[PDB]
Amino acid sequence: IDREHQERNAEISACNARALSEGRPASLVYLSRDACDIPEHSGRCRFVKYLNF
Amino acid sequence: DEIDREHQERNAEISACNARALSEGRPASLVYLSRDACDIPEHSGRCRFVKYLN
Ligand SMILES: [Zn+2]
Ligand SMILES: [Zn+2]
């Protein structure tokens, strides 16, 4: 779980930074067990499907 | 005007959460929105976007 969060959060960092450069709001947030948007973690994590989109 | 409406509805919900939290013995940590500090991304620009206000 934690490795996959790290992996996903790296992706999120990259999207936000790109959003910033393109003059859009950078609205994405990092994942944790209490708010997670990876379907395969539902149960182990709180699946919040549209957390980041 | 619609900006204000969404601050009201969000603030109502902040109120409710804070009180629930107090009731269960946890601090009232949520903070109210205004045009000068707002965490609704869609408002960004018209409001001061403070992403992690809450
Ligand atoms: Zn997860
Ligand atoms: Zn606002």
Coordinates of N, CA and C in Angstrom, one line a residue, chain A residues 4-26:
Chain A
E4 N 2.7 2.0 -3.2 CA 1.9 2.4 -4.2 C 1.4 3.8 -4.0
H5 N 1.3 4.2 -2.7 CA 0.9 5.6 -2.4 C 2.1 6.5 -2.8
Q6 N 3.3 6.1 -2.5 CA 4.5 6.9 -2.9 C 4.5 7.1 -4.4
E7 N 4.3 6.0 -5.1 CA 4.3 6.0 -6.6 C 3.2 6.9 -7.1
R8 N 2.0 6.8 -6.6 CA 0.9 7.7 -7.0 C 1.2 9.1 -6.7
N9 N 1.7 9.4 -5.5 CA 1.9 10.7 -5.0 C 3.0 11.4 -5.9
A10 N 4.0 10.7 -6.3 CA 4.9 11.2 -7.3 C 4.2 11.7 -8.6
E11 N 3.2 10.9 -9.0 CA 2.4 11.3 -10.2 C 1.6 12.6 -9.9
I12 N 1.0 12.6 -8.8 CA 0.2 13.8 -8.3 C 1.1 15.0 -8.3
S13 N 2.3 14.9 -7.8 CA 3.2 16.1 -7.7 C 3.4 16.6 -9.1
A14 N 3.6 15.7 -10.0 CA 3.9 16.1 -11.4 C 2.7 16.7 -12.1
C15 N 1.5 16.2 -11.8 CA 0.3 16.8 -12.4 C 0.0 18.2 -11.9
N16 N 0.2 18.4 -10.6 CA 0.0 19.7 -10.0 C 1.0 20.7 -10.5
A17 N 2.3 20.4 -10.6 CA 3.3 21.2 -11.1 C 3.0 21.6 -12.6
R18 N 2.6 20.6 -13.4 CA 2.2 20.9 -14.7 C 0.9 21.8 -14.8
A19 N 0.0 21.6 -13.9 CA -1.2 22.4 -13.8 C -0.8 23.9 -13.5
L20 N 0.1 24.0 -12.5 CA 0.6 25.4 -12.2 C 1.2 26.1 -13.4
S21 N 2.0 25.4 -14.2 CA 2.7 26.0 -15.3 C 1.6 26.4 -16.4
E22 N 0.6 25.6 -16.5 CA -0.4 25.9 -17.5 C -1.5 26.9 -17.0
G23 N -1.3 27.5 -15.9 CA -2.3 28.5 -15.4 C -3.6 28.0 -14.9
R24 N -3.7 26.7 -14.7 CA -4.9 26.0 -14.1 C -4.7 25.8 -12.6
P25 N -5.8 25.7 -11.8 CA -5.6 25.4 -10.4 C -5.0 24.0 -10.2
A26 N -4.1 24.0 -9.2 CA -3.4 22.7 -8.9 C -4.2 22.1 -7.7

